[PDB]
Design a protein around this ligand. Structure first.
Ligand code: ORN
Ligand code: K
Ligand code: K
Ligand code: K
Ligand code: K
Ligand code: K
Ligand code: K
Ligand code: K
Ligand code: K
Ligand code: K
Ligand code: K
Ligand code: K
Ligand code: K
Ligand code: K
Ligand code: K
Ligand code: K
Ligand code: K
Ligand code: K
Ligand code: K
Ligand code: K
Ligand code: K
Ligand code: K
Ligand code: K
Ligand code: K
Ligand code: K
Ligand code: K
Ligand code: K
Ligand code: K
Ligand code: K
Ligand code: K
Ligand code: K
Ligand code: K
Ligand code: K
Ligand code: MG
Ligand code: MG
Ligand code: MG
Ligand code: MG
Ligand code: MG
Ligand code: MG
Ligand code: MG
Ligand code: MG
Ligand code: MG
Ligand code: MG
Ligand code: MG
Ligand code: MG
Ligand code: MG
Ligand code: MG
Ligand code: MG
Ligand code: MG
Ligand code: MG
Ligand code: MG
Ligand code: MG
Ligand code: MG
Ligand code: MG
Ligand code: MG
Ligand code: MG
Ligand code: MG
Ligand code: MG
Ligand code: MG
Ligand code: MG
Ligand code: MG
Ligand code: MG
Ligand code: MG
Ligand code: MG
Ligand code: MG
Ligand code: MG
Ligand code: MG
Ligand code: MG
Ligand code: MG
Ligand code: MG
Ligand code: MG
Ligand code: MG
Ligand code: MG
Ligand code: MG
Ligand code: MG
Ligand code: MG
Ligand code: MG
Ligand code: MG
Ligand code: MG
Ligand code: MG
Ligand code: MG
Ligand code: MG
Ligand code: MG
Ligand code: MG
Ligand code: MG
Ligand code: MG
Ligand code: MG
Ligand code: MG
Ligand code: MG
Ligand code: MG
Ligand code: MG
Ligand code: MG
Ligand code: MG
Ligand code: MG
Ligand code: MG
Ligand code: MG
Ligand code: MG
Ligand code: MG
Ligand code: MG
Ligand code: MG
Ligand code: MG
Ligand code: MG
Ligand code: MG
Ligand code: MG
Ligand code: MG
Ligand code: MG
Ligand code: MG
Ligand code: MG
Ligand code: MG
Ligand code: MG
Ligand code: MG
Ligand code: MG
Ligand code: MG
Ligand code: MG
Ligand code: MG
Ligand code: MG
Ligand code: MG
Ligand code: MG
Ligand code: MG
Ligand code: MG
Lengths: 46, 34, 271
RNA sequence: GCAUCCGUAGCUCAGCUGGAUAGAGUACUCGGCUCGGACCGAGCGGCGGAGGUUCGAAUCCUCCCGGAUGCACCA
RNA sequence: GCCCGUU
RNA sequence: UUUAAUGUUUGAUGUUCUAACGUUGACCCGUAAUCCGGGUUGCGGACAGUGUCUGGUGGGUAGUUUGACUGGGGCGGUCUC
RNA sequence: UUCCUUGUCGGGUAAGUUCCGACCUGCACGAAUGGCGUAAUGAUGGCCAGGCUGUCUCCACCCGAGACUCAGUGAAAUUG
RNA sequence: CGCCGGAAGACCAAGGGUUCCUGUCCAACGUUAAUCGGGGCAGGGUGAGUCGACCCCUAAGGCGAGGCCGAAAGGCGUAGUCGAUGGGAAACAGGUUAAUAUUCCUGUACUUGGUGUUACUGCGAAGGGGGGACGGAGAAGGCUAUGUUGGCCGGGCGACGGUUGUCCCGGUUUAAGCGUGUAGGCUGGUUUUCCAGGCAAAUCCGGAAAAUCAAGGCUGAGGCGUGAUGACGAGGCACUACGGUGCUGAAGCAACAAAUGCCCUGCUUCCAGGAAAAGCCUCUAAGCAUCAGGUAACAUCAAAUCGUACCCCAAACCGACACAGGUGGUCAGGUAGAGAAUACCAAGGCGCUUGAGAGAACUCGGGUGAAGGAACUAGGCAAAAUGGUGCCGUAACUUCGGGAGAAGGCACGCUGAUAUGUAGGUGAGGUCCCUCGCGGAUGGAGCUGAAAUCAGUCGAAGAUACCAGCUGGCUGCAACUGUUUAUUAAAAACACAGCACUGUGCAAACACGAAAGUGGACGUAUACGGUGUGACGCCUGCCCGGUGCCGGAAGGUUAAUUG
RNA sequence: GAGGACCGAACCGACUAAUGUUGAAAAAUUAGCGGAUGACUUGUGGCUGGGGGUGAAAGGCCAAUCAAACCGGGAGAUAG
């Protein structure tokens, strides 16, 4: 039957992509936390 | 939720397996000590 | 003309429709149309602020002249049209210079009638004059509250307002609710009643007919759980409490008017 | 089975004056008005039983009997 | 003001 | 005890006024703009509205309490001398 | 909705705690937290009849997939 | 040999990302073996002015200079700017690679810009107007895709009786563009004069008046001609690494049937009354005026960038798996049939990655059954049974629609005749007329083709398979169609049309928001919110002491304040 | 040629039975079943955020989790 993950690249980038993170103050703190952890992928992007 | 299982990383909620009241064939007539 | 439908199916047994054959069968006048997209009863916070609104047929907005300030120039009524935005019908008029406008269609008004606005117009149904030039006792509609603002009272189908007195700079109006109100005498009004007076005679007949108008179903508060409504709960059908709104304010009798700046205009409240 | 309240004139009900004195309506009886009602004037008619305290009980105790009311739940 | 009935 | 007279006065209600304040009335401009601001005028007008203080109401919402003994708990009874 | 209760009477059955009709003694119905009716409708609750049958008396045989044997691969719950 | 064939075939979007093709390898991966693979390694492969994106334009919505509001963070929103699932220029047929093709090659086309020359000329917008531009249902007519049969052309004369014929097999294909303007749809045309309208202007739109003509214009499938002396073509001949390669090539017409596709964004009808903006056309303002610009012809130049392999109802996507699950669009052959149902087939694609034996109990999925026929069981659960078309016939009750396919019954195949194939449909030739053509009348060849009656005939059975209602009687509840506990409850629960009470005079009540504001509503008491009841019919009695609500102001009590 | 009209595929749903229950599957399959022009169904995009949303109302649903989601922190909460 129909499962919860139905992929769509446009809805992925609009919801959690780089410009979506940079738009708000709380999204820019997500990026600061991930840069401080040293993560190889900051956002979910291309 | 079981978030870092190393033997079964694919599943987080497993109590539908071994707990008898959470299996699909549980019947409430098993609980007749009421 | 009200017609009863024949009971060929259970959803047709109780339908009573109002069918007016003098309406224009055709497309409306396109320069006076605007987009009107639906809300769902939701505000700019995205939250439902009025319940039971949703769906329905697509509708275009007709720009209706509620001001009637084109003074001195006569106008001939072209045809009567259907308006999905209101209970009344609207009329397309043509002024002598070549301007077309939509007005509310009054009672008894046909295609070919002559209307005129202004201070020196005649006392006949369809003309719009200030209320210092209207005889006391007249039946008017589309009444202004402030001068130049546009008509706001007695707009629905079959409604009207009677002019009871004129004392000074004010006139007293008997509103359709039974309320006596003072409005200043420089405000305009249109002679006659609003047309389509058998709009209240129609019966929808079935549940889907209410859904075509964008009315969603009402759930009774006594049919809920206590977490959802004050009336909720019970083992069977229990009520036990005084009837209230979903937010706990007493309905069935408690007054909610709180407006200290408009009380001087109200002579007598409704009863 | 437990808990609570009641047993007063033929009938329906007051009286606990904190213990020292029993009444009301209706019924019934007698006389009158007119043959009988209605009406008028008089009258008669007794604290559920069995012990206990008490100078003394319808009243306060203890038990018995009878009548009502409520409860008898979770398995 | 009220004032029934009579095998 | 009881009243009137003169001089002086605040509180109450009432009546107008405009100049604070309101305007989700009209017009003009910034302006290619149903926002906003300024200007002109009309209608309200010391009301309304808001701040501080205060009486009432307030399961709309919140934090909690709701004893023990007991031939199982509950119900009944008991709790000190 | 009725505890007593399988109330009593009538119908249906050889035999009916259910069903249908009536009675009224309504423990503890009742008028818009509606009363009583009601054609049509319902994967709705109860009851009866015709047809039909391996549902049953009472099982028998047959056709396939497993079970069994050989070769290859090869788990699991549990366990002082 | 078996299975699918409204897919288990073919083409895509989404998503994935090299799984595509060739060579090579078999440790691990593949539920077995593997020489094979969507596995390992190496090489190759995706070619565009026209397809898509990008681009121009907007919807819902997002963000938002100033602004308004908020302890801060921030919230809302104007001008704007983004945002497709919608609108906007243009390409087709054939051939070719192991793997791409409307992209390469061959043939024949089209669109939008820049520049230049010539001829002529009022051009110009952030403004005006038109257009773009829009619902549901239904009906008919004209067509095409496509199919069938005939004719024509090539081949055949049959492993076993017959088969030179009314015999058998195969083929009979051709586009965009350009030209012509038909079935159909809509609309009166032209000229002159004037005007409180379209924020100013306007020769444009709107309005008024007058004259004159009996016609004009717009839209539009298909057909026909050309494109095409080409291309393709059943087959045959010649080589070969036996995979394939090279050359040549006949016929290439007609009739009938026919869509859910096209004409059709039409027509008719109904109420619930059915996007926006640009491209496009047109008008003028400031302005420029031998300029610039506009229009037509011709020449020339430009049309960039990114995607393009492959899978896509699946072993490549979402499900931990090469997992009986889930996943939007497009194409739609034959026989029978009402049909996209169903059965068997075509093109095409597959036999589902463990097999081999045996023929015990028992389990699963089915077939049949003597006599009985619900005796089974909580309960006819499950099975069995009914089943099509035409015609006859059909009760109580009813809101007059229903109930009703009530119930029940009869006919049904094949062959011949009526009639060498009828009624009906289609309609060539010939002839006549004109408007001389895609025209009209007459005419009927050819093709297609039900249904019925009569007679005969075979079987146990003619709706023979697949497919395809069990029926009736009484009663509770809910009027009805709907909705609900994703994963034990589909109901008598929820909703519902209808009814009543109550609030609400517009800066409405109310709701979301410290607020600004927004919804209610571009609505205005025949409207809107809340509450209860629940179609319809007959009705809805008595109680205001208690609690609540509404009204009242005399008196009593009564806060901050004052002192 | 009307209809929340009728029969019935696609499509949407989930009433009954059997199988399965370390399943082929963390809810399916097979055989029947209901709606099937509408209060229908579906693709793409958008909005509503946790004492909040949304709810033809079942405490239903809000990423296999719901009488208060998930993640991190107070945090080694407290545990007669
Ligand atoms: N949101 C879905 C996550 C699925 C995950 N593998 C689980 O077992 O929960
Ligand atoms: K309701
Ligand atoms: K309930
Ligand atoms: K002012
Ligand atoms: K005030
Ligand atoms: K004890
Ligand atoms: K014990
Ligand atoms: K009862
Ligand atoms: K008998
Ligand atoms: K009997
Ligand atoms: K049902
Ligand atoms: K029934
Ligand atoms: K190997
Ligand atoms: K496997
Ligand atoms: K698009
Ligand atoms: K326009
Ligand atoms: K004109
Ligand atoms: K223009
Ligand atoms: K390609
Ligand atoms: K064996
Ligand atoms: K049938
Ligand atoms: K009823
Ligand atoms: K159901
Ligand atoms: K429900
Ligand atoms: K109302
Ligand atoms: K609005
Ligand atoms: K009362
Ligand atoms: K009261
Ligand atoms: K009272
Ligand atoms: K029809
Ligand atoms: K949609
Ligand atoms: K929460
Ligand atoms: K989650
Ligand atoms: Mg995983
Ligand atoms: Mg509502
Ligand atoms: Mg309602
Ligand atoms: Mg409930
Ligand atoms: Mg509550
Ligand atoms: Mg109850
Ligand atoms: Mg004694
Ligand atoms: Mg008597
Ligand atoms: Mg006598
Ligand atoms: Mg004043
Ligand atoms: Mg509380
Ligand atoms: Mg605490
Ligand atoms: Mg205890
Ligand atoms: Mg005890
Ligand atoms: Mg009996
Ligand atoms: Mg009975
Ligand atoms: Mg009741
Ligand atoms: Mg009651
Ligand atoms: Mg009531
Ligand atoms: Mg009843
Ligand atoms: Mg074995
Ligand atoms: Mg073995
Ligand atoms: Mg087959
Ligand atoms: Mg690879
Ligand atoms: Mg390959
Ligand atoms: Mg292997
Ligand atoms: Mg392969
Ligand atoms: Mg490979
Ligand atoms: Mg590899
Ligand atoms: Mg493009
Ligand atoms: Mg904003
Ligand atoms: Mg701060
Ligand atoms: Mg844009
Ligand atoms: Mg390919
Ligand atoms: Mg325009
Ligand atoms: Mg064609
Ligand atoms: Mg030859
Ligand atoms: Mg030959
Ligand atoms: Mg032979
Ligand atoms: Mg625009
Ligand atoms: Mg996948
Ligand atoms: Mg998968
Ligand atoms: Mg996963
Ligand atoms: Mg496999
Ligand atoms: Mg699969
Ligand atoms: Mg599908
Ligand atoms: Mg099929
Ligand atoms: Mg084939
Ligand atoms: Mg066997
Ligand atoms: Mg038998
Ligand atoms: Mg036999
Ligand atoms: Mg037999
Ligand atoms: Mg039996
Ligand atoms: Mg038995
Ligand atoms: Mg059955
Ligand atoms: Mg009968
Ligand atoms: Mg009938
Ligand atoms: Mg009839
Ligand atoms: Mg029949
Ligand atoms: Mg015969
Ligand atoms: Mg019953
Ligand atoms: Mg129902
Ligand atoms: Mg239903
Ligand atoms: Mg459940
Ligand atoms: Mg469930
Ligand atoms: Mg559940
Ligand atoms: Mg179930
Ligand atoms: Mg269920
Ligand atoms: Mg309401
Ligand atoms: Mg109800
Ligand atoms: Mg009542
Ligand atoms: Mg009061
Ligand atoms: Mg229907
Ligand atoms: Mg569902
Ligand atoms: Mg099912
Ligand atoms: Mg099924
Ligand atoms: Mg169905
Ligand atoms: Mg059915
Ligand atoms: Mg159906
Ligand atoms: Mg609908
Ligand atoms: Mg979506
Ligand atoms: Mg509950
Ligand atoms: Mg999760
Ligand atoms: Mg969940
Ligand atoms: Mg909590
Ligand atoms: Mg701490
Ligand atoms: Mg701890």
């Amino acid at each position: 039957m129909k499962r919860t993950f139905q992929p769509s690249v446009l809805k992925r980038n609009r919801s959690h992509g780089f410009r979506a993170r940079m738009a708000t103050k709380n999204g820019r703190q997500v990026l600061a936390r991930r840069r401080a952890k040293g993560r190889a992928r900051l956002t979910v992007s291309k | 939720m079981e978030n870092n299982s190393r033997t079964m990383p694919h599943i987080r909620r497993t109590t539908h397996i071994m707990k008898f009241a959470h299996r699909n064939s549980f019947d409430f007539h098993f609980f007749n000590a009421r | 003309a009200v017609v009863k439908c024949k009971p060929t199916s259970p959803g047709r047994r109780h339908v009573v429709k109002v069918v007016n054959p003098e309406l224009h069968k055709g497309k409306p006048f396109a320069p006076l149309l605007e987009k009107n997209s639906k809300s769902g009863g939701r505000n700019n916070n995205g939250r439902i602020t009025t319940r039971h609104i949703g769906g329905g047929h697509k509708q275009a907005y007709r720009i209706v002249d509620f001001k009637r300030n084109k003074d001195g120039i006569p106008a001939v009524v072209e045809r009567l049209e259907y308006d999905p935005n209101r209970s009344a019908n609207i009329a397309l008029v043509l002024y002598k210079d070549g301007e077309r406008r939509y007005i509310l269609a009054p009672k008894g008004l046909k295609a070919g009638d002559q209307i005129q606005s202004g201070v020196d117009a005649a006392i006949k149904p369809g003309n719009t004059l200030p209320m210092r030039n209207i005889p006391v006792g007249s039946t008017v509609h589309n009444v202004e509250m402030k001068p130049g603002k546009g008509g706001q009272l007695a707009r629905s189908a079959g409604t009207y307002v009677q002019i009871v007195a004129r004392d000074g700079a004010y006139v007293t109006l008997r509103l359709r609710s039974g309320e006596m109100r003072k409005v200043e005498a420089d405000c305009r009004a249109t002679l006659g009643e609003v047309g389509n007076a058998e709009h209240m005679l129609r019966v929808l007949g079935k549940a889907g007919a209410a859904r075509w108008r964008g009315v969603r179903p009402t759930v009774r508060g006594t049919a809920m759980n206590p977490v959802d409504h004050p009336h909720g709960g019970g083992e069977g059908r229990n009520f036990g409490k005084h009837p209230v709104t979903p937010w706990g304010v007493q309905t069935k009798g408690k007054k909610t008017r709180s407006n200290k700046r408009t009380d001087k205009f109200i002579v007598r409240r409704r009863s």
